[PDB]
Structures are given as structure tokens and as C-alpha cells.
Amino acid sequence: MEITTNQVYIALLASLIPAFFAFKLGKSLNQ
């Protein structure tokens, strides 16, 4: 059934984790 606002929040905060890892990998590939 309908995805709740809580499950949107958890999804967002989870998404912050591969944002950080993206930054790390980017910095590393950029010499």
C-alpha cells in the first residue's frame, strides 16, 4: 500500500551514504 512519509525519510537518509562514498571515489580518481 501507500509508502509513508517515514519511509521517504529513511530512504533519504540512507541515500546520504552513497553520496559520501561518491565524493570519496571522485576525489580518489581525481589524482
Partner 1 sequence: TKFPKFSQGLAQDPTTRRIWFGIATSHDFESHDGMTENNLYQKIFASHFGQLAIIFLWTSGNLFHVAWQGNFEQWIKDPLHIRPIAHAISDPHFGQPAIEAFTRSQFPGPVNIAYSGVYQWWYTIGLRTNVDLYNGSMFLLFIATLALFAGWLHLEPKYSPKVSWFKDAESRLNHHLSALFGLSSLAWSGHLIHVAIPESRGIHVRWDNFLSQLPHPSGLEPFFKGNWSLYSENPDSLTHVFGTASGAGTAVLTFLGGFHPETKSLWLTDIAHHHLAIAVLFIVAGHMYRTNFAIGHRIDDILNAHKAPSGKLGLGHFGLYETINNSLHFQLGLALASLGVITSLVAQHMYSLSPYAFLIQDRTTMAALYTHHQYIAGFIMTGAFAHGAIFFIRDFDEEKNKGNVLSRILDHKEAIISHLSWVTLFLGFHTLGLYVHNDVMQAFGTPEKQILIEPVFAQWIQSAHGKNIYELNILLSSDSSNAFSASQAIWLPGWLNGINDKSTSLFLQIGPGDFLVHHAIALGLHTTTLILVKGALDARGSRLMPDKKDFGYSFPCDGPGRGGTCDISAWDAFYLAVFWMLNTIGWTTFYWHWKHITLWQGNVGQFNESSTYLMGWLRDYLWLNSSQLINGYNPFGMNSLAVWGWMFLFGHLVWATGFMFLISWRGYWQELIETLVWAHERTPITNVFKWTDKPVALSIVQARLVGLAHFSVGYVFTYAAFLIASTSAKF
Where do contacts with partner 1 occur on this chain (CB under 8 A)? Answer: 1-3, 7-8, 11, 14-15, 17-18, 21-22, 24-25, 28-29, 31
Among 13, 14, 28, 31, binds ligand BCR (CB under 6 A): 13
CB of 4 to ligand BCR, least distance (A): 13
Determine the 3-state secondary structure of 17 from DSSP: helix
CA 7 to chain centre: 14
b/e string for 6-21 if b means 16 or more Cβ within 10 A?
eeeeeeeeeeeeeeee
Size of the site for ligand BCR (CB under 6 A): 10
